[PDB]
From a paper:
Odorant-binding proteins (OBPs; aka PBPs, pheromone-binding proteins when they are involved in the detection of pheromones) are the first relay in semiochemical reception in insects as they are the liaison between the air medium that broadcasts chemical signals and odorant receptors, which are located in olfactory structures (mainly the antennae and maxillary palps) of the insect's peripheral sensory system. Mature AaegOBP1 is a protein with 125 amino acid residues, which shares 82% amino acid identity (91% similarity) with AgamOBP1. The overall structure of AaegOBP1 comprises of six helices (α1 to α6) connected by loops between helices and knitted together by three disulfide bridges between α1 and α3 (C26–C57), helix α3 and the top of helix α6 (C53–C104), and helix α6 and the top of helix α5 (C113–C95).
AaegOBP1 crystallized in space group P21, with unit cell parameters a = 34.37 Å, b = 47.93 Å, c = 69.12 Å and β = 96.50°. Electron density was well defined for most of the structure, except for a few side chains, the first residue of chain A, and the nine initial residues of chain B. The final refined structure contains two monomers of AaegOBP1 with 240 residues, 410 water molecules, 3 Mg2+ ions, one Cl− ion and one putative PEG molecule. Interestingly, the C-terminus is pulled to the core of the protein to form part of the binding pocket wall, which can function as a “lid” for the release of ligands. The C-terminal “lid” is held in place by an array of hydrogen bonds, which is well-conserved between AgamOBP1 and AaegOBP1, namely: Arg5-Asp7, Arg6-Asp42, His121-Asp118, Asp118-Lys120 and Tyr10-Asp7. The carboxylate oxygens of these residues form hydrogen bonds with the hydroxyl of Tyr-54 and the δ-nitrogen of His-23 (AgamOBP1) and Arg-23 (AaegOBP1). Indeed, AaegOBP1 binds to a mosquito attractant, nonanal, with apparent high affinity at the estimated pH of the sensillar lymph, but with no affinity at the low pH postulated for the environment in the vicinity of odorant receptors due to negative charges surfaces in the neuron membrane. Differences in ligand specificities by these two proteins might be conferred by different residues in the binding cavity, which are located close to the C-terminal lids in AgamOBP1 and AaegOBP1: Leu-15 vs. Phe-15, Leu-19 vs. Met-19, and Ser-79 vs. Ala-79.
Residue numbers in the entry:
A (entry chain A): 2 to 125
B (entry chain B): 10 to 125
The structure:
Amino acid sequence: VTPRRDAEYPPPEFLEAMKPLREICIKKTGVTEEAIIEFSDGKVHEDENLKCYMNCLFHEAKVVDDTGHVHLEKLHDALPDSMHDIALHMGKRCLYPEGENLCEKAFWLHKCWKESDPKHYFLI
Amino acid sequence: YPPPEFLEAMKPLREICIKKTGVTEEAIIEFSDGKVHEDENLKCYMNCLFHEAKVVDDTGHVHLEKLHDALPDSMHDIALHMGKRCLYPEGENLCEKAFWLHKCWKESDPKHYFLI
Ligand SMILES: [Cl-]
Ligand SMILES: [Mg+2]
Ligand SMILES: [Mg+2]
Ligand SMILES: [Mg+2]
């Protein structure tokens, strides 16, 4: 299925709310705009800087536990109300990330989400 | 509700686990439909069902995706909302963590929570 992109979805308030965090995280990780857009709207691809950008966003958004790992309940609680059920179905077979570091774990989650629901998956 | 197919599938696991853990039938019904309570054998009964249902990982902790997949499809959505704030169990052993999950589910949706 093809990615949903319109005035209503992804939720504009969420996209604007993540702007400053994206700016922080692009500066820290050196990910290209092209890697982000391609991962969001195109085919899954694996780029090292993108993985740490993904991790960076979790950290800046304060959706991590006290060891720096993604806390999926905090993440759900943080998401827009309009995404409540979308996020639940997108995340339900992505509960236990695997990876040698937090960048790899963050990428595991995004890849799993994208695989699960390519229509509603997007990357800030 | 509960879905008939689940009641049927659970029966052989209940038999094994009541025998193994010594939990009382009354303890099960009390937890299922009444107030949350702690009974030691109940907690290990709960663990035993997860083990016998083969929904645990290599160290015996519940694999919540396996659990979800093992539930009747009619309970998919109910399970999802029960589970959404019950992801990271706490406890000193598998019985305490198994209880933690059941308590968390029961606290989240008492109307649809049951224990067989
Ligand atoms: Cl919710
Ligand atoms: Mg919310
Ligand atoms: Mg199911
Ligand atoms: Mg709750």
